[PDB]
Ligand binder design. Sequence first.
Ligand SMILES: OC(C(F)(F)F)C(F)(F)F
Ligand SMILES: OC(C(F)(F)F)C(F)(F)F
Ligand SMILES: OC(C(F)(F)F)C(F)(F)F
Ligand SMILES: OC(C(F)(F)F)C(F)(F)F
Lengths: 22, 22, 228, 228
Amino acid sequence: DLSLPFPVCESCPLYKKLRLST
Amino acid sequence: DLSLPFPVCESCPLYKKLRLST
Amino acid sequence: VDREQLVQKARLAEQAERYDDMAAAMKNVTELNEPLSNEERNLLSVAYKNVVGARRSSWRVISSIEQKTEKKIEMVRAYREKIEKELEAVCQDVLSLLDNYLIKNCSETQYESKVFYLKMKGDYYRYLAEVATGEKRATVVESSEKAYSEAHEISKEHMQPTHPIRLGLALNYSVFYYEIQNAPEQACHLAKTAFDDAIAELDTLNEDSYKDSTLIMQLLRDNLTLWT
Amino acid sequence: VDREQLVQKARLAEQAERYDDMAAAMKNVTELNEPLSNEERNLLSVAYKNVVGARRSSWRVISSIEQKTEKKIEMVRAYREKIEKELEAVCQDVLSLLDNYLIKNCSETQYESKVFYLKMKGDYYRYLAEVATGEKRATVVESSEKAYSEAHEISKEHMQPTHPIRLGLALNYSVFYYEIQNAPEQACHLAKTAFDDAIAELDTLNEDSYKDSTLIMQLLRDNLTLWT
Ligand SMILES: OC(C(F)(F)F)C(F)(F)F
Ligand SMILES: OC(C(F)(F)F)C(F)(F)F
Ligand SMILES: OC(C(F)(F)F)C(F)(F)F
Ligand SMILES: OC(C(F)(F)F)C(F)(F)F
């Protein structure tokens, strides 16, 4: 999947966003 | 969890059993 | 149960990885027929993204098995069709919430919400397009492009190029061109233009969202690298 | 749909990680009121293990949130209770299949099947015990011990000490003593005895199951190391 993998909000930790992106 | 983590049958690959155990 | 308890239930369901419960909670919140806060918007999106994503993942597994293989192929095709109908039902659920509540009652000055919801509309028609064939596919592909293009026009006019919702729209719109329309040149132009417009206006990064902005810029660059 | 198609559906559902579908398929197979093959036995067990396991995981998350935290605690407790009732319903579903079909119609010479099903019965009463309190907990704890102990006696008499079902029974029975009964000495004795009995009869390893035997021996050793 190449689409946006995480929610755009500060209450989601960056580590979670990076894990969802990789 | 300390209980049996995989099914006891040959059709389940050993790599799967090891991943479930670790 | 009041609205505050429904949102708390959605947060709890998310932590428990019970996304059907999370989506039902946020559907109930939407059906209170009032606008959604930024947090409620994100909870609704996360809920349905994970519900539909499980169906997408299962559909790809069963479809790959259907290609690699009497009563057996009849069962594989029937099971794929079962998952397909579930996926389509989830998407139509989301699209009904968007068309009849969320987009419908957006104020004139709520450009960020309009782009967020129109992007979602484009996304869920794109998920329909992934499994649709024939005339059905052409209809949902058209609907996906219409939503993305309107979101793009609004975001171009009313949002900074570094705004993470505008960048995430470009990311998904470019994916639509690459994966659905088989149009890699248009996909690359959309992704490169968004990346370049963001980097040219780096001084517009916001203290509350600069992490999302810079990360989505990297996702755009990642796809361009993969596609060129 | 015939039995062959139901088992194929279970295999497909497993690949798609749709374990509710997998369990429903294997429940339908069991309700044809004929014995289960070794493969059907394993499919039924995998299905329900994953269904109940999702509920166990969610219950532990919500229970930890309930301990760490007006209408909020009322919702957290209510949500925990919702998950609890789902977990209990899954366990009672399994236990009904075991008591009314699978154990009920085991032949006299099917010792391996009897141990497999009695171990499952012990397992699902143990999962009930994890969430039960008061007199309800004492009842299911008693039922779990009764099933495990009968499985243990049968396996002692009719199965080789290296048989993977006998070893896996000792593994789970020992966990029952450690986690449910708070009896680490009895848990260690069960695990060490099973490990020692297996290693003393290494020459009984079977070509078709020696990997499972040696792996479960390591799991027993792992728990003994953790507990001593
Ligand atoms: O995932 C949640 C959402 F939905 F983005 F609000 C969290 F609050 F955790 F970020
Ligand atoms: O994909 C990027 C990588 F590669 F991890 F750096 C991102 F930063 F976006 F995760
Ligand atoms: O998990 C399956 C089961 F259930 F053990 F039969 C597999 F066949 F894949 F092993
Ligand atoms: O837990 C063992 C270990 F540690 F991985 F070797 C087992 F072999 F059982 F996986």
